[PDB]
Amino acid sequence: GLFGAIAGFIEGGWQGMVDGWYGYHHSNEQGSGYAADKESTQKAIDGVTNKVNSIIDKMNTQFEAVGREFNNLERRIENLNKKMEDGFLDVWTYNAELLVLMENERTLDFHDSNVKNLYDKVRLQLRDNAKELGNGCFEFYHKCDNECMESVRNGTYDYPQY
Amino acid sequence: GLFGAIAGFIEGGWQGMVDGWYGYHHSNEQGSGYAADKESTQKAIDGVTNKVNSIIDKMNTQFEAVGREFNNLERRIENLNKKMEDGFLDVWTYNAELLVLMENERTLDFHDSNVKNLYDKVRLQLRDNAKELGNGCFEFYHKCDNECMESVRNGTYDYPQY
Amino acid sequence: GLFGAIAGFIEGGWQGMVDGWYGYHHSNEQGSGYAADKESTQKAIDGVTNKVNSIIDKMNTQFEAVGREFNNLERRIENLNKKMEDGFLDVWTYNAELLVLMENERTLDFHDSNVKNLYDKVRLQLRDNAKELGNGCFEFYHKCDNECMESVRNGTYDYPQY
Amino acid sequence: DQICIGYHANNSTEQVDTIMEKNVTVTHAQDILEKTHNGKLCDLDGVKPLILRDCSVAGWLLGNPMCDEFINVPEWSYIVEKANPVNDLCYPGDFNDYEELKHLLSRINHFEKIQIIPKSSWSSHEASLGVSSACPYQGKSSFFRNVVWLIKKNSTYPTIKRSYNNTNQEDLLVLWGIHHPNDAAEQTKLYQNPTTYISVGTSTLNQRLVPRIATRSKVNGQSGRMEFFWTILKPNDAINFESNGNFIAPEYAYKIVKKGDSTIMKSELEYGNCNTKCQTPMGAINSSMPFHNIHPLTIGECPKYVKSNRLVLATGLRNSP
Amino acid sequence: DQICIGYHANNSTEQVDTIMEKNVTVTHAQDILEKTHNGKLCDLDGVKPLILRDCSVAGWLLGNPMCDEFINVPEWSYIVEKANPVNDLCYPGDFNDYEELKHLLSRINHFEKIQIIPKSSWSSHEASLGVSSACPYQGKSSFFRNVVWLIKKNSTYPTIKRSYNNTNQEDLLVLWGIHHPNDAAEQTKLYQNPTTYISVGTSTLNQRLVPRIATRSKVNGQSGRMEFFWTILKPNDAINFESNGNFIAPEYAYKIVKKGDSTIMKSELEYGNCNTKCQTPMGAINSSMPFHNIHPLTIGECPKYVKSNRLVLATGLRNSP
Amino acid sequence: DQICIGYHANNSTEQVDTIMEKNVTVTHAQDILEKTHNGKLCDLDGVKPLILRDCSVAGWLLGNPMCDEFINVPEWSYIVEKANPVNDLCYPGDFNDYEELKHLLSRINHFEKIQIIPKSSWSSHEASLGVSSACPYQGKSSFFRNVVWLIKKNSTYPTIKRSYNNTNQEDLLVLWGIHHPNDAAEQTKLYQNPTTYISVGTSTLNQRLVPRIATRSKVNGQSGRMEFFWTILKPNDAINFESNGNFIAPEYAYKIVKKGDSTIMKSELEYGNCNTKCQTPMGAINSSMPFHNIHPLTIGECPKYVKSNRLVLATGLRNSP
Numbered sequence A, B, C: 001g002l003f004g005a006i007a008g009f010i011e012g013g014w015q016g017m018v019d020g021w022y023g024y025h026h027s028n029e030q031g032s033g034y035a036a037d038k039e040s041t042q043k044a045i046d047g048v049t050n051k052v053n054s055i056i057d058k059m060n061t062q063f064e065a066v067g068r069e070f071n072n073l074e075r076r077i078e079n080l081n082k083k084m085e086d087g088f089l090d091v092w093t094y095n096a097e098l099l100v101l102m103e104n105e106r107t108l109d110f111h112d113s114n115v116k117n118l119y120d121k122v123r124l125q126l127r128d129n130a131k132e133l134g135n136g137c138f139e140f141y142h143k144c145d146n147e148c149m150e151s152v153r154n155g156t157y158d159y160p161q162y
Numbered sequence D, E, F: 001d002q003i004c005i006g007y008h009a010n011n012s013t014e015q016v017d018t019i020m021e022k023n024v025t026v027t028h029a030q031d032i033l034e035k036t037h038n039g040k041l042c043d044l045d046g047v048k049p050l051i052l053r054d055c056s057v058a059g060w061l062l063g064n065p066m067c068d069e070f071i072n073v074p075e076w077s078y079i080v081e082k083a084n085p086v087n088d089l090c091y092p093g094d095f096n097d098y099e100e101l102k103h104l105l106s107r108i109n110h111f112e113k114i115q116i117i118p119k120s121s122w123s124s125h126e127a128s129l130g131v132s133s134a135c136p137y138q139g140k141s142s143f144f145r146n147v148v149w150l151i152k153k154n155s156t157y158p159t160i161k162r163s164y165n166n167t168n169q170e171d172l173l174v175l176w177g178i179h180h181p182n183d184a185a186e187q188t189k190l191y192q193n194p195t196t197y198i199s200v201g202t203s204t205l206n207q208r209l210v211p212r213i214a215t216r217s218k219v220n221g222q223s224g225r226m227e228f229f230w231t232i233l234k235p236n237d238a239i240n241f242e243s244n245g246n247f248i249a250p251e252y253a254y255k256i257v258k259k260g261d262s263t264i265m266k267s268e269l270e271y272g273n274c275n276t277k278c279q280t281p282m283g284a285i286n287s288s289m290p291f292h293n294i295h296p297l298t299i300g301e302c303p304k305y306v307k308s309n310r311l312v313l314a315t316g317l318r319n320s321p
Ligand SMILES: *[C@@H]1O[C@H](CO)[C@@H](O)[C@H](O[C@@H]2O[C@H](CO)[C@@H](O)[C@H](O)[C@H]2NC(C)=O)[C@H]1NC(C)=O
Pocket: D165, D166, D167, D236, D237, D238, E217, E218
């Protein structure tokens, strides 16, 4: 993916994280677990929802065929009519298929970008107080209990404290 | 945004930087101030200008309606005509609205990318001679007077010197 | 470019790397050389190949003009016919030109992204065992013979070893 | 101790296409193309279609005696006609500007048939002998019930000079016809006079038909031909007829009570005892999808028709194996 | 000491839409849709339109005596006709292939009217008694000024055999007509002969009209009808007329001097004493925008018409609150 | 010691356009627009076109004596006609519903001409004197070879009552005509009877033509006119003709043996002794590209036509200077 996170430096997803699209997994002496990042998830939900409603709505006005009959010596205009109606269908079929292709690609990259941004947001907090393992994880130099972990998820990781 | 800089790790913009789209703010014992990065700004101006002229120009050739009249027993072709003209308007209205939507999204992401790239270009100069604060700023380990600051804006920051 | 690698922090390409789109150049006491990254290259080839076949194929169904004749007192429908056929050509010409423009832009950015991702994949292995020079290169703290270099290209660089 | 950043995965096998990659498995997806229908012709929001069954629009409107079912039909949502209805013009001929009239019915939901010229009204001509074996009814020779094939009386067809004034508020559809016989012997045998005409006038109409004699192939056992014409008589206008012979005179004409959104749908399907918001020639649609691929010719509140076999938007992200 | 990377912000409240987000505030934006017009009909690059006012194209070309304003009109950029002009055919009737002729005027900027058959030239028929109360002029009975309704002279309408040779360089539009009277009594009262015709020939035309007698609704107090015809007489060709009676003969015909880009625009608006590069039926456009949404039917150098209510491109970046 | 990440560069000068940047040099690119053709008219997959050369479709089908080359033509892939063929109707006139017939030929690959009414068969009329100097052949007066201009015999043109039964399996195209003479003197000089007609009937056709007398401009030295008509006679149907005079009778008619994909292509080019899969009016196309910009009217397995001057997709990456 364009942003390199999903199926990139983060090898795969988490069956175990059920309550959001992106989040954290922690590991300390007290235990381990998955916690969803609510802000980035909701952002992703709003964007994709608006994309779908945008797509549905732009396609709202679109060609409607109408039954039109012609006699045995009006073949030319019968054919003009058939061509005209078919032509618009082909145009609108193309618009629908291409839009879906193009936006699907952007939706996948959008998710990738959200993961990368959440990873960086964490990286930029921890700075040199943690080893960047290269797989999505940061190994702390200090011990980091559930309150410590929560502060990293907060946006609050007190760097001068550790 | 896809690149995570604008309204991301850089929280907001600068009312105080008036002479460009992207640039620097410095702070040392001598004072503080905003300086625009001319190269990245001009690059942004060229790209967006070409995008607008590309959009205007692709839409140049497009369906033109023409007055066409029919009598009381030519209803079928009158209707064919109305359908045909309306159909092309709907197609061209869709092309215009979708293009604007799609490219607006790309323009915003383009700016985001330019900011991120300018931030990285600075980061890659300073290396471990400055603390990466996580908000767009770098705090120097050494003192960094106006000549020092200018060298970072130059592309010239002499790393082995400091 | 959006991802900042191609013609960005990596100044230019390598005439000397002939067997792939992206790869590595090494330099040690034993010599120097170019080696292509096969995985990222093949990925790039698959994506671009599918893009071309997608483009060719979506355009497969498209308006076909047909010879239609009218007499001296059927001018209105002759004109309707000419307008209708011309209208579809303009629509399909626009679809072809815009698609090429839009996807060319994405193809260039795609390559940029692949380079950036390959650079990061290396960066994330080496961590603090190498200086990030800022130009695409990493200068090792330890000596790094051909076997060492190969392990960086492997995905195998043993960080706790060095 | 560590903290990792990650993303959702699940057991989804839904796939979406992109420009660069086909069949990408995703955690979540949204189909937007309706592919199914109920295979039936249904009422449109409670309003039943006019199903002409084995009759054509012409057989219906002229009153082909095989089309009695459609004498005084109630309001309709849309009309359904077969591709080749067997009960069209029972006595062979042409229906003039038939396609333009059909187009007119695409904007009509209801007719109210009324008698403008009574059959008893023809005191100088024979009004009950204009019947053919080509238009049988219950074993006997009959004819289009809405027009009267007038013939001579005691070897005299005197000139006809009739008028009808459209006094009612609603546009009136008026049908008449002309008979084209096989030869001069048949002309005198039916209408006496050798050279005849039918003149028809309104505020806008200036017509004068003359019978056209020729030997023709037999169709339904008849080598003669009936040519049918029509006009729309506006309110407060009058139509005048003048004829020597060969005149197929109106008896009943159609009052255009309700105008609106209709369509003549072409289908072999019969009534399916159902209701729907969206009807197509192959069946009715019941969906919330923005698109469908059943048939281009629809009526009602319908999704937008595309030729696609598949339209699926990614909502979620790339699902891990 | 520190150095920060940042981006411009300002006091802009301009907004743009994207696929994923509506109403995004940006530092800079560029509207590309022209939404305004001046509400007037104007000269097109200094060349004034032909404004037919209360006359139709037919009233104009035939010379309906209420349409004298448009006798010998100068060159025009475009034509403007109302939706239902009151001064059309003052004596009721039809104009044959009227829509095809109108289409022909979409490619004409100038006529130069000339006299091909003088009114004094009719030495055997009465050329100044062909007038009706349905075409009044200054309180008196008149008629289409460009054609002459010929009637009998001392109870004789002898056969007419006239020719006009298109000697001039420019295609010539020629109008004539036929009169359809109410009855046999009126036929003899005007043209004497009971059975008449009008034969018309050119290198391409092979016509023979016959009057059609019928009792019709009165329109403008007239139950008779006038049916008007036309052709384009090429240079160096000749048109021949032959008639027993009922012939409405050309006097004046139109020389097609200038061909070019024109249009028949439909509008109730009158002249607005202005000039413009781009005209629409609702008003003129003066803008540099690539798009507008005023009206699809434009003439001149115009932006491209779309049905949009809003088209705004982002140029700047996401503006901070 | 170091390791660097980098990307390919080469000596390519290929360029591609993007929205934001024109003329970007890339390492690899793929042209998708075919811009060349061979400038010739060719066989379509081994099947040669019908090249009418200086004849029109009418000249061909009626058998204008300058169009003998196209007597009994073999199967064709497509037809080629010049913009203004000189050998059209040698004796001036009109061809009725000519454009509808041309449209019919867009769906026909082969005719097989057959004799339905022998020329010797006309025992009561003169069948070999219907010739004009306007249709010369080898210095002598001739006529459309497929129809017979019948004239009187010993000052009598007795009524004609002929029938042809379409016994063969294949739809039959039948041509006939009517002669419109200059005056009453010429009517009696050719057909004796002053007032004539031609009646034509099939299961569907109910026609009765009457000659139309008028003085016309000379075209090819003739002021008379010939008006040609046609029908499609279905299998097992019969056509009946009745006439007093002026009847241009069928001799040969066309058997529609093969229906299929054809086109009437308009071009001044002659045969180019070649074969191709894709033909256009300006020349043949031999390419694998998805698009071309030669001409919109093509026949065969062709790329898709666009108005572009250039369509080049980037495959590689931005090439370094
Ligand atoms: C019958 O049709 C005529 C015209 O073809 C129409 O005018 C009649 O309506 C009345 O005509 C009267 C003239 O004698 C007129 O004085 C009266 O206003 C008019 N009625 C209306 C409602 O317009 C028609 N016959 C009727 C209504 O009995």
